Amino acid sequence: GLVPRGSHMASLSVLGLGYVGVVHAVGFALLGHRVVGYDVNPSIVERLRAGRPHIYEPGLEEALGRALSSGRLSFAESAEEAVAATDATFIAVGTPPAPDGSADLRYVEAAARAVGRGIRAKGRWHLVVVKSTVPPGTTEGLVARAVAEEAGGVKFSVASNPEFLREGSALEDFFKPDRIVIGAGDERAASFLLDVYKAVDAPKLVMKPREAELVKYASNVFLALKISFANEVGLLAKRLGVDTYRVFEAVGLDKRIGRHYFGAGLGFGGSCFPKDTLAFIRFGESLGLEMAISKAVLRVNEYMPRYAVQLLEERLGGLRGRHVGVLGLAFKPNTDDVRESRGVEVARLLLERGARVYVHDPMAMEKARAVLGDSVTYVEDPQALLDQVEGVIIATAWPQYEGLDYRGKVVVDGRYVKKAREAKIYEGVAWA
Amino acid sequence: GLVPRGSHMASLSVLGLGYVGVVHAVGFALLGHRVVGYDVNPSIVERLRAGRPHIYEPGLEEALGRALSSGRLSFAESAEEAVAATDATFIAVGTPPAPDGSADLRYVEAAARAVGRGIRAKGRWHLVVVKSTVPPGTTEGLVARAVAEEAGGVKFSVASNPEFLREGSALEDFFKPDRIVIGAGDERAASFLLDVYKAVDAPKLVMKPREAELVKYASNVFLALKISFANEVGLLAKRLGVDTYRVFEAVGLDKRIGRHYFGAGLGFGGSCFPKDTLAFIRFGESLGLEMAISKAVLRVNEYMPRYAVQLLEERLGGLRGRHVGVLGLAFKPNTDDVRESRGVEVARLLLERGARVYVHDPMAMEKARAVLGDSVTYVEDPQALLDQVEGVIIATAWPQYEGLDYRGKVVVDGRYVKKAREAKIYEGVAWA
Numbered sequence A, B: 001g002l003v004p005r006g007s008h009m010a011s012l013s014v015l016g017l018g019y020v021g022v023v024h025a026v027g028f029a030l031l032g033h034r035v036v037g038y039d040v041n042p043s044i045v046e047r048l049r050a051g052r053p054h055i056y057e058p059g060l061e062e063a064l065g066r067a068l069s070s071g072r073l074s075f076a077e078s079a080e081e082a083v084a085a086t087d088a089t090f091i092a093v094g095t096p097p098a099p100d101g102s103a104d105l106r107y108v109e110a111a112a113r114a115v116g117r118g119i120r121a122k123g124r125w126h127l128v129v130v131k132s133t134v135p136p137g138t139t140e141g142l143v144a145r146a147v148a149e150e151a152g153g154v155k156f157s158v159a160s161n162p163e164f165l166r167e168g169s170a171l172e173d174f175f176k177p178d179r180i181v182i183g184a185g186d187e188r189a190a191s192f193l194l195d196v197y198k199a200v201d202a203p204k205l206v207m208k209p210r211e212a213e214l215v216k217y218a219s220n221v222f223l224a225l226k227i228s229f230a231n232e233v234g235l236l237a238k239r240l241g242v243d244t245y246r247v248f249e250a251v252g253l254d255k256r257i258g259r260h261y262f263g264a265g266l267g268f269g270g271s272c273f274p275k276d277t278l279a280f281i282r283f284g285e286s287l288g289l290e291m292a293i294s295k296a297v298l299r300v301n302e303y304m305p306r307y308a309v310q311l312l313e314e315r316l317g318g319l320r321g322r323h324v325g326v327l328g329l330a331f332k333p334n335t336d337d338v339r340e341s342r343g344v345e346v347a348r349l350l351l352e353r354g355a356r357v358y359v360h361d362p363m364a365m366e367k368a369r370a371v372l373g374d375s376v377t378y379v380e381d382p383q384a385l386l387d388q389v390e391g392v393i394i395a396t397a398w399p400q401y402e403g404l405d406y407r408g409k410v411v412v413d414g415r416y417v418k419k420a421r422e423a424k425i426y427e428g429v430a431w432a
């Protein structure tokens, strides 16, 4: 119902406007806060000011137009000005893999220094909140230090507040999160973020900054582990002539086991799970730990796309000169994102084996071309792609794929499409 | 409410009266079936006829007395007579590890031959149901063959119907299972078991016998995997000075992740998880598969008790001649079962390092003596044990342990007891 009197409107900035940053910036404005965003790329800022998302995310264009109409969302000309105009800054810049697989923290360090400069100009207390996925210790270590080194002696507080948004449903996960984790460096940080999130109906857990940072890796690596476990069990089910999805239907009814994320197939792609899992392994190894399960998780994941190509190659009797399609290039359905896409990886493996490769995706073909260029043929109609190839690998289960005519084709199914069983030869990547 | 007319009373036999067999025998009788049980050990049968459970299981003595009073439960003088007097036989004998870690199937094979002899004497169709944890393929392979080889040509059907009972809550899991899995070798098998379970309100999934067998290993190994994952994450949390249980409180709120079985500590013992995990690995390796995650699961598990002893040894500056206690010998709370107990394993490691070892358990000390003999001192009062030792390892979180006085002691906590933090030195085995 009604808003209680004296219910404070917070002034928040967000640095880094990938899907995490732009969904928080828009969402906080729609929750009732004044938000100032900034990104290193001026064309992102220009597009966002115009109400035109630079990335595809269901419902974002309308949430953005609503946040802009409220007058509560704006964008700054520099990181420092966004910071100086607000009381807390969410750092949401990327943490891509470094060359040795550890987390690359240079983007977070530059954003923290910008925060320190804005604080110095503001002259009063500010909260620095790390939304970026960063190894435990980064918030009170690197970020607090980089901020202090620029802040000219102005006092501030830090907090880790990890994010759990999934691409494809980020706005819903923003408004209805399963839980909010606040790793506050002090009481004033904790009370400020509990205020920021007061309108969100979800459990709020306040803990140390290190614990909150570890929650994020433990969560993402455990999801990756369910997927790789389903694939390990699936290789076995496939040898037994059994349906791995029916097995995990029964496994998931146990009240101790989550029924989701046992979707065996080509494995996980996207810009999070592969690189967070690798960062987690490298971080543990830097402390002398073996990380044996987490490494196994990645070994299975890296194997699956090679196995899918080996199945196709065995069924066709070699791939050189053969006409082969890949259905699906986005890293999952309903995005145009190809980062770490298993479909792209499968196309490359096919190419490296002398196949003539055709690809389709309902959304990601422009992004995939950015990566594959003219090395493949891009087909606009997925049926037309099937009609042209001898063999096909299904790499993303777009709903339109369920209705295609696979009859007479050799199909290596990497995502479980029930209709594909009608094929002349059906090979499940991790099931019979 | 009322029982519909013509609601058939099934005649069922059970071979093998460990906790699975005796809980099914009693439970089926209480559901309304006529049950005939048998076990290779005549003293078990004699005790059960007298209403005296040979094993400790909460509520069993009363369920048994009720099943016996109904007149519906009896016990045979031989496996063959139990079989010949019924229409379906649940095989529930053990499947311990063989010398090379694979499943030992000799107990199941002998029970299946007995079933075949009873069928031959009966002269008409019978259902053979495998409740034993057996590798996929065993029901329609070894068991169907061993039955046919003795049945003299009498027709029969087979089914895998795995069991998911936990020790300590087996009667409740019997009456209120999360799901019933029926891997029927034909339609008549499926319809017979759906009848047997008609009064149990739970989802019933009918599938191939191989799929049902694989569900059981996938479920038990996945639970073991959660535990080992919590321990892998816990070694890391401990290096960070963080509380792993608070981390997995937050991880478990994700709607994709089951909140249970992330109890980091000394790892899993008991007669199921260690040997089923090892059987699963050996079964996959027999088909040429690497089983990398499942092996990692066991590597972490085998490490934890060694690590706990290493922590104690480091804190005390060597263990030779030192007086050290183990609190907890049962493999989990509320049983007297010590099979594969981590407490026993820790006592042995301590012994092998020249410690003078004291042990306590509220129930399992007689069973543990069967294993450790006079190599340790058995202490009746756990406080008295603490008062006598310099260092202690907590290996089973019996509720009475939460109230003890650990002040001034060196404690390596293997199970998360909050009160133990009052110790002079507190080392969590997998947390700070």
Ligand SMILES: O=c1ccn([C@@H]2O[C@H](COP(=O)(O)OP(=O)(O)O[C@H]3O[C@H](CO)[C@@H](O)[C@H](O)[C@H]3O)[C@@H](O)[C@H]2O)c(=O)[nH]1
Pocket (backbone or CB within 6 Å): A133, A163, A164, A165, A166, A167, A168, A220, A223, A227, A260, A261, A262, A263, A264, A265, A266, A267, A268, A269, A270, A271, A272, A273, A331, A332, A333
């Ligand atoms: O059962 C499954 C589920 C997913 N996937 C694959 O796993 C990858 C990741 O999928 P998803 O979790 O939807 O994508 P993200 O948007 O990368 O979301 C993850 O990464 C975000 C960034 O850290 C976290 O906030 C989210 O909680 C976590 O889901 C995709 O390639 C999926 O196709 C499977 O192979 N099998």
Ligand SMILES: O=c1ccn([C@@H]2O[C@H](COP(=O)(O)OP(=O)(O)O[C@H]3O[C@H](CO)[C@@H](O)[C@H](O)[C@H]3O)[C@@H](O)[C@H]2O)c(=O)[nH]1
Pocket (backbone or CB within 6 Å): B133, B163, B164, B165, B166, B167, B168, B220, B223, B227, B260, B261, B262, B263, B264, B265, B266, B267, B268, B269, B270, B271, B272, B273, B331, B332, B333
């Ligand atoms: O978070 C946890 C939970 C359990 N344990 C340990 O794991 C072992 C197994 O515990 P539990 O699952 O209670 O014992 P079981 O009676 O061995 O039950 C398992 O094995 C039965 C036999 O197959 C299956 O039916 C059950 O579903 C499965 O729980 C014990 O040593 C526990 O102390 C942990 O270390 N951490």
